[PDB]
Amino acid sequence: KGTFKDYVRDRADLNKDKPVIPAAALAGYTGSGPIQLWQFLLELLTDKSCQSFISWTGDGWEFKLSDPDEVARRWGKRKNKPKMNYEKLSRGLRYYYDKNIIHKTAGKRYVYRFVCDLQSLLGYTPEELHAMLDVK
Amino acid sequence: KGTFKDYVRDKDKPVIPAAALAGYTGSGPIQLWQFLLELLTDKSCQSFISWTGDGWEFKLSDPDEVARRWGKRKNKPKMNYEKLSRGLRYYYDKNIIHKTAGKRYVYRFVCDLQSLLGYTPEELHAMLDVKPDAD
């Protein structure tokens, strides 16, 4: 067990992958109150550790979902909404399609793309984050 | 005004964050004694709550402000010092926090925090620049 001081030290020495765009801060910034799906997606995209199931493609704000179900799950376990899955996640993406926040790339299986002006909202450029995340 | 990048630009966290202590102790939801520890280990709260200099003894210079803060951290706006006192009374039965006889709004942690937190009262007082009260 050890003490709290050892716990902090150890976590600070081990845990080393904090998302560049935390959905939480983003909701506070946009004053959206409750966490939003598009904000959550950004958090996962600006987190190297998640590059296993979700990452940028290198072309603008385009990103692919290597494992859609992993996003859906982490989406349901983050909003404390276990009743949330890939299906209840697919409904959220189409809303974003009609609201022009995220568009699906034609031909691709699970390759979406943010179509709103993120650069003016986040302050970062696509190529910038791409470099901060070692995007390939 | 200003992009998110600029928004992030706008003192460090307290030594004993309640959330962390909760994770560490596995209590799950934040507990009042853990929250009190955070305010006591945060230089920016010394106006309404602070250490007295004598071990784990602390006092509430602004009880209502503590109760109000505790309210926002757990989403309970109707929170006042009366309710908070119920919490303190409970902590007196669980031997976590005791009240100092004679004084008012002066309590003391009586559990072995030193063995839990890994800090000594003297160590924390220095990191927070605490001056011993007068009596």
> Which DSSP string do the residues of A23-89 spell out, in sequence order?
HHHHHHHTT--S--HHHHHHHHHT-GGGTTT-EE-SSTTEEE-S-HHHHHHHHHTTTT-TT--SHHH
Residue in B127, B84, B130, B125 with CA at minimum distance from that of residue B107: B84
Q: How far apart are CA B78 and CA B76, in angstroms?
A: 6
Residue in A28, A31, A61 with CA at minimum distance from that of residue A46: A61
Q: How far apart are CA A67 and CA A72, in angstroms?
A: 9
Whose tokens are 């109707």? That residue is: B78
Whose tokens are 């189409």? That residue is: A94
Whose tokens are 């709550």? That residue is: B49
CATH of the domain at A38: 1.10.10.10
The answer to whether the CB atoms of A122 and B5 lie below 8 A apart is yes
DSSP at B125:
H
> Which residues of chain A lie closer than 8 angstroms to B24, CB-CB?
4, 7
Q: Which residues are CB-neighbours of A69 under 8 A, at least 6 positions away?
A: A85, A86
Q: Are A42 and A123 in contact (CB under 8 A)?
A: no
CA dihedral A56, A35, B15, B46 (to 10 degrees): 140
**C-alpha angle with apex A24: A90 to A4, nearest 5 degrees?**
125
Parallel, antiparallel or unpaired: strands A102-104 and A62-64? unpaired
Round to the nearest angstrom and report the end-to-end CA distance of chain B: 50
Residue in B43, B39, B38 with CA at minimum distance from that of residue B18: B38
Task: Encode A88-112: b = buried (16+ Cβ within 10 Å), e = exposed.
Answer: ebeebbeebeeeebbbeeeeeeeeb
Q: Which residues pair with B58 in a beta bridge?
A: B51, B107
Distances (CA, A) of A124 to A29, A128, B92: 15, 6, 52
| Method used to determine the 3D structure | X-ray
Whose tokens are 């009586």? That residue is: B110
Beta sheet of A55-56, edge-to-edge order = A55-56, A62-64, A111-114, A102-104
Distance from CA of A109 to the nearest CA of B (A): 31
Q: Is A123 on the interface with B (CB under 8 A)?
A: yes
Q: Is A26 on the interface with B (CB under 8 A)?
A: yes
The answer to whether the CB atoms of A4 and B118 lie below 8 A apart is yes
Q: Is A122 on the interface with B (CB under 8 A)?
A: yes
Distances (CA, A) of B1 to A42, A116, A129, B20, B105: 21, 18, 22, 32, 42
Q: How far apart are CA A44 and CA A55, in angstroms?
A: 8
Q: Are A52 and A66 in contact (CB under 8 A)?
A: yes
Distance from CA of A119 to the nearest CA of B (A): 9
Q: Are A41 and A71 in contact (CB under 8 A)?
A: yes
Whose tokens are 């959905």? That residue is: A23
Tokens of residue B127, six digits = 């990191």
Task: Encode B1-38: b = buried (16+ Cβ within 10 Å), e = exposed.
Answer: eeebeebeeeeeebbbbbebbbebeeeeebbbbbbbbb
Q: How far apart are CA B92 and CA B83, in angstroms?
A: 15
> Which residues of chain A lie closer than 8 angstroms to B109, CB-CB?
none
Partner residue facing B117 (CB), from A5, A26, A29: A5
- Among A1, A4, A21, A114, the strongest candidate for a mutation testing the B interface, having the largest count of B CBs within 10 A, is A4
The answer to whether the CB atoms of B20 and A29 lie below 8 A apart is no
Q: Are B106 and B53 in contact (CB under 8 A)?
A: no
Q: Is B105 on the interface with A (CB under 8 A)?
A: no
Q: Which residues are CB-neighbours of A9 under 8 A, at least 6 positions away?
A: none
DSSP string over B103-118: SSSEEEE-S-HHHHHS
Number of domains in chain B: 1
Domain range spanning residue B4? 1-135
Q: How far apart are CA B100 and CA B106, in angstroms?
A: 6
Tokens of residue A24, six digits = 């939480």
Q: Are A73 and A20 in contact (CB under 8 A)?
A: no
Which chain B residue lies closest to A30 (C-alpha atoms)? B4
Q: Which residues are CB-neighbours of A90 under 8 A, at least 6 positions away?
A: none
> Which residues of chain B lie closer than 8 angstroms to A22, CB-CB?
none
Q: Which residues are CB-neighbours of B132 under 8 A, at least 6 positions away?
A: B52, B53, B54
